Amino acid sequence: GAIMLDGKATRDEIFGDLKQRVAALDAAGRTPGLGTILVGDDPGSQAYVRGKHADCAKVGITSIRRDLPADISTATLNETIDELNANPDCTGYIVQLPLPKHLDENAALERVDPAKDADGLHPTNLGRLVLGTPAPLPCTPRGIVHLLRRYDISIAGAHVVVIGRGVTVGRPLGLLLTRRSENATVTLCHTGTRDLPALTRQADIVVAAVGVAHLLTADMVRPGAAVIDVGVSRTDDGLVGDVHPDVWELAGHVSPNPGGVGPLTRAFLLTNVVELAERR
Amino acid sequence: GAIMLDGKATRDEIFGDLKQRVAALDAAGRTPGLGTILVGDDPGSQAYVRGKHADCAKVGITSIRRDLPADISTATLNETIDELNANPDCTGYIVQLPLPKHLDENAALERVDPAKDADGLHPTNLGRLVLGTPAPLPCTPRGIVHLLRRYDISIAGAHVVVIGRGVTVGRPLGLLLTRRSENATVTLCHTGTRDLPALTRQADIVVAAVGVAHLLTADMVRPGAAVIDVGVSRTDDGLVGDVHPDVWELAGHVSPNPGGVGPLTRAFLLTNVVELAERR
């Protein structure tokens, strides 16, 4: 049976580090604050934002909320974005998605100041990742790499097969893993890929982030290989990951879904906020 | 023998298209202008900038030059950047590298307005490429894809092995080829890669962009495969590409070096400028 990549225990470890580092920022009069912009009342969006602020409260990060009605204008969204940009207690913030359809989501995301981009998803910071300039990194790719290293799985020289090209996971992950400080070989796969199994069988690490229930099966995985389960989709049975349970037999390591990468995404949101405050 | 991917003939074809499109912009009172910032007097830098403006003159694009002495201050560079940013005849511009060492190159590159980023290398536009928002694309990756398509080589479903992780070729190329509109599978290789030949032998398309003289040999290439020669390094014999001449025997297609991708990079610089003007 594969070793369980315990994301919850890893997240708790990060929280404890963050709490000390936030206490040190607080002592210097530099308490970090997380802002959130939430438009309307989608119950899932509400629950995500609650969760982020509850985690902030656990580590001592101030909560700044901008809760707006579903019918705001573009100018009202922009005023809020501009205000958070100029707000000296807001060290970083996120815009909760999805936005009401009368609102240009992407324009809103670009208007965010990249110096306050807690998600690490502003195009300017993603471009900086392409170019090798230090800047906020996207939370999920970053937690995937941290989880692997936490268990002493080698990254340098590894063949990583990434299944999925999502703008917040697959695509930025390929850029992160090919930096000299990581130094993995990456094959980027997706729905346009011919003969996926032949590629996954070569991989030391498989990252399944495509959102197709149990797509990755035992016959596609090299024995001993590390398997990261990121994608989630809805089936008749509820929410299911991208990795078939049979993979656990011969894989060396598997991150569970839930309780694997999900908690690391959240840890690195708070890590980004703390680091933005420390970088002054 | 492999089919020769004739970049010069392809570039000339693009120039002819651009000249007509520039004549149409001119007729609407919207003549495009290319700016260049050149600091000091490096002879190669001088020759590149001359070449870009000579190509502009061929197609009817106005030349805007900012030729600065090697000893300017940071504030003087910034004034020039800000001026080109606000210059209504400057539709796009480039900063010629390298800059004198007392000057922060990257800060200068970020200060450029991404709406005038003729090179497609501003971090904001590279982030937009990650995110799938339309924006200027980097010239070399774009010309590599155009050259392949010009010869009816399939991109969708292709396994592309990219050798090299340069910020202006390898890294952005991996992002470009994995868009749905391209839809290739990409393995990103580099000096950290274990057993490169085993990966290149799988490839339908090999892009050699690492700058290691004749690194790619016949035994590493699948018969019938398309080979793109981008890298250049200095040996005792002068300047040499990344592909060994023996590859020509069994490859289906090879771009020469010189006369392959080099001319396409230049064509897509002018294409970017023309498109920025057309997009209004």
Tell me the three-class secondary structure of chain A, residue by residue: CCEECCHHHHHHHHHHHHHHHHHHHHHCCCCCEEEEEEECCCHHHHHHHHHHHHHHHHHCCEEEEEEECCCCCHHHHHHHHHHHHHCCCCCEEEECCCCCCCCCHHHHHHHCCHHHECCCCCHHHHHHHHHCCCCCCCHHHHHHHHHHHHCCCCCCCCEEEEECCCCCCHHHHHHHHCCCCCCCEEEEECCCCCCHHHHHCCCCEEEECCCCCCCECHHHCCCCCEEEECCEEEECCEEEECECHHHHCCCCEECCCCCCHHHHHHHHHHHHHHHHHHCC
Tokens of residue A24, six digits: 């040190």
Nearest to B171 among A130, A187, A194 (CB): A130
Which of A157, A193, A194 comes nearest B194 by C-beta?
Answer: A157
Which H or E run includes B232? Answer: strand B232-235
CA distance A243 to A236: 17
Q: How many helices (H) and strands (E) does chain B have?
A: 9, 11
Bridge partners (DSSP) listed for residue B253? B3, B226
Asked if omega into B138 is within 30° of 0 (cis), the reply is no
The tokens describing A123, both together, are: 């195009």
Q: Where in chain A is the domain with CATH 3.40.50.10860?
A: 7-137+258-280
Resolution, Å (one decimal): 2.3
Task: Report the residue from A123, A128, A187 with minimal CB separation from B133.
Answer: A123
Rounded CA separation A144/A206 (Å): 11
Length of chain A in residues, anyone?
280
**B203 and A CB contact within 8 Å:** no
Q: Which of chain A's residues have a Cβ under 8 Å away from the Cβ of B183?
A: 190, 192
Please, are residues A264 and A7 in contact by the beta-carbon 8 Å criterion?
yes
Structure tokens at B245: 């001449």
Rounded CA separation B32/B57 (Å): 11
In which residue ranges of chain B is CATH 3.40.50.720 found? 1-6+138-257
Lookup result for tokens 């970088």: A279
**Whole-angstrom Cα distance, residue A98 to residue A77?**
14
Cα distances from A228 to residues A33, A154, A168, A252, in angstroms, run 31, 14, 15, 11
Q: SS3 for B222?
A: coil
**What is the separation of C-alpha A39 from the centre of its chain, rounded to a whole number of angstroms?**
21
For chain A, say whether B43 makes contact (Cβ under 8 Å): no
Instruction: For residue A69, give the nearest of A93, A107, A103, A35 by alpha carbon.
Output: A103
B123–A122 CB contact, under 8 Å: no
Among A128, A185, A199, pick the best mutation site for testing chain B contact (most B Cβ within 10 A): A185
**Which two three-digit tokens encode residue B263?**
């001319």
Chain A positions touching B130 (Cβ under 8 A) are: 123, 126-127, 129-130, 167, 171-172, 175
CATH 1.10.760.10 for domain B1-6+138-257, yes or no, is no
H-assigned helices in B118-252: 123-131, 139-150, 170-177, 196-200
Quick check: A21 and A59 in contact, CB under 8 A? no
B64 forms bridges with which residues in the sheet?
B35
Distance between CA atoms of A147 and B31, rounded to whole angstroms? 54
Name the architecture of domain B7-137+258-280. Answer: 3-Layer(aba) Sandwich (3.40)
Give the number of residues written for chain B: 280
